[PDB]
């Protein structure tokens, strides 16, 4: 948290603090990054909803994926929305468990496994060629998208022998990521949801009505057995205060 003097421009402070952010990127470890904060304050939290399933068909992972890759990319289309943040749910991870007895039987470390995995999830370039005047570029495969494909991977070669496959040493599956944030309704059960932020110094009623009608029109394409349930909205307090003040003025 960087704190400046009062009265200064927020965006100027953002520029000045980013002025010293590039000198440390390369100095930072590889598997990490440095993200910046949104353009809002604690008051930015305006709306809050949860995705409930009145059945046992869909799992928390499906709801989390839906909220992360379907709604987040739509609500933000609203112009004045600072950003939307997911909460709860489960992050589906393709986890591979190993068996040390097999590693001993075949004598292979883990660095070679890492190298093999980092060389089996990408495609190549496809610079075109001058065939018949209907030009014809190239494209290779190599994206891991199936567990059967995970099982057919090489670790070490044995000329005129048998190459060791991953299925013979390990086992792949899908599971939950290491959770750091959870959410829940009343004793009904666990649920995933999202929270909406607001750009510092902007109207609320407008964006609230926008998100409301957006969810209304979007509920149609929503999967079956799924429902949105709101939990927080300033519009109620705002209109209540407005009505109170108007009545006081009238009396």
């Amino acid at each position: 948290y960087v704190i400046f003097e009062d009265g200064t421009d927020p965006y100027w402070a953002r520029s000045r603090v980013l002025e010293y952010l590039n000198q440390v990127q390369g100095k930072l470890p590889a598997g990490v990054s440095a993200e910046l904060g949104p353009d809002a304050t604690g008051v930015g939290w305006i709306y809050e909803y949860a995705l409930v399933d009145r059945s046992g068909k869909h799992d928390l992972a499906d709801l989390r994926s839906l909220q992360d890759w379907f709604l987040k990319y739509e609500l933000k289309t609203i112009p004045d929305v600072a950003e939307v943040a997911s909460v709860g749910g489960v992050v589906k991870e393709y986890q591979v468990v190993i068996d040390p007895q097999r590693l001993a039987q075949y004598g292979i470390s883990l660095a070679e496994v890492k190298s093999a995995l980092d060389a089996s999830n990408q495609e190549a370039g496809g610079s075109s060629i001058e065939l018949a005047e209907a030009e014809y570029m190239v494209r290779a495969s190599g994206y891991l998208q199936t567990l059967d494909d995970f099982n057919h991977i090489v670790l070490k070669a044995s000329e005129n022998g048998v190459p060791v496959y991953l299925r013979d040493v390990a086992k792949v599956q899908i599971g939950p990521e290491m959770r750091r944030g959870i959410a829940e309704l009343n004793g009904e059960g666990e649920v995933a949801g999202g929270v909406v932020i607001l750009r510092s110094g902007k109207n609320a009623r407008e964006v609230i009505a926008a998100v409301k009608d957006k969810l209304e029109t979007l509920k149609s394409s929503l999967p079956e057995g799924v429902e949105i349930v709101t939990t927080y909205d300033r519009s109620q307090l705002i209109d209540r205060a407005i009505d109170n003040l108007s009545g006081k003025l009238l009396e």
Binding site: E130, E133, A134, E135
Partner: protein
């Protein structure tokens, strides 16, 4: 425009230098306009440079009326220092009307500033220059009297007009009904103006672009380009 206003003045007043007034009253207004733009940028585009050609014609009317009334009252006094004082009196007796008229024709251009958009911000500078020039010319007409004091045929016009005025005055309601007929018949071009709005600006240069399919080699493209250039 300057030479035609000058010859008109010399024709209707039989070689009087009143034309000079215009030549020392209309250009100065332009300056004022430009000055305003300097305080807020607004680089001079082609629309701004064009609007002034109509602004000058819209503005010359005040100076025309002023010089006309001044010469009229002078010729009237001819029937009989303080002379120029009564000239200034005869000028101020109509000054305020012209001032208010210039102010109103100036402020009547806000609806252009209202709209905003690619065409809106294209046209904005035109209306800005217009309004600033009108205000400058209003001020100059307010101070056009010193340059003013520094310096047969119409009988036919009145002979043709007065009988018509005497004829029409006896039938005003007929004139009102004629105006009604005019504002009725106006409807025909309104509904059939046509189309092709916002015409394109012609230039001595040109640019050719064909719509074509994606697939193309590195040599076929060069060959086709050379063939098209040769043709």
């Amino acid at each position: 425009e300057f030479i035609v206003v000058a010859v008109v003045c010399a024709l209707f007043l039989w070689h009087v230098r009143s034309a000079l007034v215009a030549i020392i009253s209309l250009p100065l207004g332009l300056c004022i306009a430009f000055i305003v733009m300097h305080f807020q940028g607004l680089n001079a585009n082609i629309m701004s440079l064009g609007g002034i050609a109509i602004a000058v014609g819209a503005m010359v009317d005040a100076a025309i009326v002023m010089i006309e009334n001044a010469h009229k009252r002078l010729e009237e006094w001819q029937h009989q220092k303080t002379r120029w004082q009564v000239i200034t009196d005869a000028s101020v007796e109509v000054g305020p009307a012209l001032f208010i008229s210039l102010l109103i024709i100036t402020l009547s251009f806000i609806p252009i500033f209202t709209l905003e958009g690619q065409e809106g911000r294209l046209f904005g500078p035109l209306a800005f220059t217009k309004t600033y020039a009108m205000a400058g010319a209003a001020l100059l007409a307010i101070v056009v009297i010193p340059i003013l004091m520094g310096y047969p045929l119409n009988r036919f016009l009145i002979r043709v007009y007065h009988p018509l005025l005497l004829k029409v005055l006896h039938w005003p309601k007929t004139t009102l009904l004629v105006a009604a007929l005019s504002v009725l018949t106006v409807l025909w071009p309104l509904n059939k103006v046509g189309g092709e709005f916002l015409p394109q600006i012609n230039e001595g240069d040109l640019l050719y672009m064909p719509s074509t399919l994606p697939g193309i080699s590195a040599a076929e493209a060069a060959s086709m380009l050379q063939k098209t250039d040769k043709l």
